[PDB]
Design a protein around this ligand. Structure first.
Ligand code: MET
Length: 531
C-alpha cells in the first residue's frame, strides 16, 4: 500500500520539565521520519504531551497553581526544548486539545457499542506515577518520601496505593487469543525481539479486564468525562493512546497549528502507525492494551512497536535530587547538536541501557566524527589534493578500487534494512564501516603523492573517495541533518541529488561537478580537549 509513513513518539507526562528521556524518544522518532523523507516518501511524524490524570493534577497542586495554567506552561517547555533540539516533527499534539477529546469520546462510544465495556469494580494496587494497574506479584516493600514503610512497584519503584472503586471495565480478557494470533502472524511487530517474547509470555499467562474509567473525585476532575456518565472520567491511558488516532486525523497548516479534524482516518492516509517509538517502561500499554482497543473498535493495528532502553550518566541514575544531571541542550551547546544526536544513537542499542560520559562522548566525537568522517571530507576537497576543485572523471579501476566500490554499492541496501527494523545503531555502524574502508583506501593510495607522480591515477582515487563520502553522508543525513548539508555543500552536490532512492546509486553525481567554495578557517567537527 502507498500511504503516508506514520511514525510516533510517546506523548509525555507534563508533571515535570523535559529531560534526556523525552529528548531521546523523540529523537528516534525524528530520525526514522527523516530517513523515510530522504527515500522520498510522504511522512507524518508525531509527538506531544499527555496532560490529564492524577499524576499531572497532583503535580500542579504541589506547585499551587491551576491544572490549565500548569499544563500549558510545561507543554510550552516541551515545545521550546524540541524546537531547540532541531527536530523535524510534523505535529505536536496535546491531550487537552478539544479535537482530541472528540476522538476519545468517539472511540469510547465505539468500544461500548461493540459490547466490550461494562460496569464493574477494580479492587487492587495502582501506581499513580505510572498511571498503571498492578497485581500483587508486581509490588514489594519500600520507603515513601517520609521514610515510612509502604508498598512500591517492582517495575518502577514508585509508591503504590490500594484502589477500590466502581469503574467501567474493558473486556481485555476476551482479546487474549486474537493478540496472540497477531504477535505470531507478525513476528516483526515488536522490536527488539526479547521484548516481543516478554509480551507473548505475559499474554500467554492470561489477561484480566482493564479499568478504563475512574471516579471523578480521585482524578481531581482533570480528565475527559465518560460519554453518558459525568461521574466517571476516562482512564488517562485510553485517553493518551488515542492521541495516535487523533493525530492521524488532523489537518495541519504551514505554521504547524491544527486546523481541522476529519471524520475518517482514511482521508489523510496515516493510520495505523508504521512505527510507534516507545520506552521499555510503557510496552504493555502499546503492545497489549492498544491493539486490544483497536481490535474491539475494528481499526487496523500498528505495523511495528519499537521499545528502547533507559539512560544512566557515569553508571549512575540521572536525577536532580541525587546530584547527577544530563541537560541535553547544555551538552549540545558544548559538543554540538548533530554530534550529541550521533552519540545517543551510536552509543546505545535498543536492547541496552546506554551510558553517557564526557570521556566516551569525546572519544566518539574525535574518533568517529572528526578522525574518520571529517578528515575524509577535508582530504577529498583539499586544494592540495583536489587541485581543480571538481569531481574528476575516473580512469580504469583496479581490483582494489572495485572492492571499495562494491562496499559503497552495497551500503544503501544494508543501511536501509537496518533503518526499517528499526535499528539505528546498526545502520550507523554499517555506514562507518564503509567510512573506515574509504580511509584505509586513501591511506593506501596516498593521493597527496599521486598529485605530482600520477595525475591520471589520482582522478580514479579521488572520484571513488568523493562518491563514497557522498553516499555515506546521504545515509547519515537523518542522523547529522545540519552537518550533512555542510558536507554536501563542500562537495558541491546539487540539491536534487541530496534525496531520493535514485541517489543511493554509485555514480549519481557526474564528473565535472564543481566543489563548493572554501572558507579561511572552516572545519566540520573540531577535536575537543581530551578530558
Ligand atoms: C501513549 S504514550 C503515553 C506515555 C506516558 N504519558 C508516559 O510519559 O509514560
Amino acid at each position: 500500500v502507498e500511504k503516508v509513513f506514520f511514525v510516533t513518539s510517546p506523548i509525555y507526562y507534563v508533571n515535570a520539565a523535559p529531560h534526556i528521556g523525552h529528548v531521546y524518544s523523540t529523537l528516534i522518532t525524528d530520525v526514522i521520519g527523516r530517513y523515510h523523507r530522504v527515500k522520498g516518501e510522504r511522512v507524518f511524524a508525531l509527538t506531544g504531551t499527555d496532560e490529564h490524570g492524577q499524576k499531572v493534577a497532583e503535580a500542579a497542586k504541589q506547585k499551587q497553581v491551576s491544572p490549565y495554567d500548569f499544563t500549558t506552561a510545561v507543554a510550552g517547555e516541551f515545545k521550546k526544548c524540541f524546537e531547540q533540539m532541531d527536530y523535524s516533527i510534523d505535529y505536536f499534539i496535546r491531550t487537552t486539545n478539544e479535537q482530541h477529546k472528540a476522538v476519545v469520546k468517539e472511540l469510547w462510544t465505539k468500544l461500548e457499542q461493540k459490547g466490550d465495556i461494562y460496569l464493574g469494580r477494580y479492587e487492587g494496587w495502582y501506581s499513580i506515577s505510572d498511571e498503571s494497574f498492578l497485581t500483587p506479584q508486581n509490588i514489594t516493600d519500600g520507603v515513601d518520601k517520609d521514610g515510612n514503610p509502604c508498598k512500591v512497584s517492582l517495575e518502577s519503584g514508585h509508591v503504590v496505593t490500594w484502589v477500590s472503586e466502581e469503574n467501567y471495565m474493558f473486556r481485555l480478557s476476551a482479546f487474549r487469543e486474537r493478540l496472540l494470533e497477531w504477535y505470531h502472524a507478525n513476528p516483526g511487530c515488536i522490536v527488539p525481539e526479547f521484548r516481543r517474547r516478554e509480551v507473548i509470555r505475559a499474554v500467554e499467562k492470561g489477561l484480566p479486564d482493564l479499568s478504563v474509567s475512574r471516579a471523578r473525585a480521585t482524578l481531581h476532575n482533570w480528565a475527559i468525562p465518560v460519554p453518558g456518565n459525568p461521574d466517571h472520567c476516562v482512564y488517562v491511558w485510553l485517553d493518551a493512546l488515542t492521541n495516535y488516532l487523533t493525530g492521524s486525523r488532523l489537518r495541519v497548516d504551514e505554521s504547524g497549528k491544527e486546523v481541522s479534524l476529519v471524520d475518517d482516518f482514511n482521508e489523510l492516509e496515516r493510520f495505523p502507525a508504521d512505527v510507534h517509538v516507545i520506552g521499555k517502561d510503557i510496552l504493555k500499554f502499546h503492545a497489549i492494551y492498544w491493539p486490544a482497543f483497536l481490535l474491539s473498535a475494528g481499526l487496523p493495528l500498528p505495523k511495528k512497536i519499537v521499545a528502547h532502553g533507559w539512560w544512566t550518566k557515569d553508571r549512575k541514575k540521572i536525577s536532580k535530587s541525587l546530584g547527577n544531571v544530563f541537560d541535553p541542550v547544555e551538552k549540545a551547546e558544548e559538543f554540538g547538536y548533530d554530534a550529541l544526536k550521533y552519540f545517543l544513537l551510536r552509543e546505545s542499542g535498543f536492547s541496552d541501557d546506554g551510558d553517557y560520559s564526557d570521556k566516551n562522548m569525546i572519544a566518539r566525537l574525535n574518533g568517529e566524527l572528526a578522525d574518520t568522517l571529517g578528515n575524509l571530507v577535508m582530504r577529498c576537497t583539499s586544494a592540495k589534493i583536489n587541485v581543480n576543485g571538481e569531481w574528476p572523471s575516473p580512469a580504469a579501476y583496479t581490483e582494489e578500487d572495485e572492492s571499495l566500490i562494491q562496499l559503497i554499492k552495497d551500503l544503501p541496501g544494508t543501511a536501509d534494512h537496518y533503518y526499517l527494523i528499526p535499528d539505528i545503531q546498526k545502520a550507523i555502524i554499517a555506514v562507518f564501516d564503509v567510512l573506515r574502508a574509504i580511509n584505509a583506501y586513501v591511506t593506501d593510495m596516498a593521493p597527496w603523492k599521486l598529485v605530482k607522480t600520477d595525475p591520471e591515477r589520482l582522478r580514479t582515487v579521488l572520484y571513488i573517495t568523493l562518491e563514497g563520502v557522498r553516499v555515506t553522508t546521504l545515509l547519515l543525513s537523518p542522523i547529522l541533518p545540519r552537518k550533512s548539508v555542510v558536507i554536501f555543500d563542500m562537495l558541491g552536490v546539487p540539491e536534487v541529488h541530496r534525496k531520493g532512492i535514485e541517489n543511493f546509486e554509485f555514480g549519481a553525481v557526474p564528473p565535472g561537478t564543481r566543489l563548493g567554495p572554501a572558507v579561511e578557517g572552516e572545519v566540520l567537527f573540531s577535536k575537543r580537549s581530551t578530558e
